[PDB]
């Protein structure tokens, strides 16, 4: 039961704190992990914009893109985190692009499939 983050290129297994969220009152599920590394090592596999896939044990919980990465260090402590949401969250903050703003006689599934085409999300009815 290990949480593996399939970042771009390689696996990342051990973590210091994991918090995953899922709900049906929302259009995304956000995750936040805490990483701890010696000061000076390269953290480039965990960068904003990378393609991530969270895999708890052998099952996938979330898949999408990394959003934020915080690094801080004080006189007696050191803390690094990382965040991210689904690929469905790409629609939330991106403006809809379509040629003719009006659909004359269409159903909700067809409208959704025409609107979520440029991004890559697949609609399920």
């Amino acid at each position: 039961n290990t949480v593996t983050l399939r970042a771009d290129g390689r696996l990342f297994t051990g973590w210091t704190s994991v918090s995953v969220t899922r709900s049906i009152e929302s259009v995304a599920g956000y995750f936040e992990l805490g990483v701890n590394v010696p000061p000076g090592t390269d953290l480039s596999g965990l960068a904003p914009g990378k393609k991530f896939t969270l895999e708890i044990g052998g099952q996938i919980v979330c898949t999408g893109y990394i959003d934020s990465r915080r690094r801080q260090m004080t006189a007696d402590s050191m803390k690094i985190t990382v965040a991210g949401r689904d690929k469905t969250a790409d629609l939330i903050d991106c403006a809809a692009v379509y040629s003719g703003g009006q659909w004359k006689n269409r159903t909700l599934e067809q409208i959704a499939r025409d609107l979520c085409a440029p991004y890559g999300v697949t609609v399920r009815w």
Partner: peptide, 17 residues
């Protein structure tokens, strides 16, 4: 941030409008 994260995540029940 309990509500501050619900804005960044989806909300199929609109808060306003």
């Amino acid at each position: 941030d309990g509500m501050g994260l619900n804005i960044y995540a989806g909300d199929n029940y609109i808060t306003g409008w």
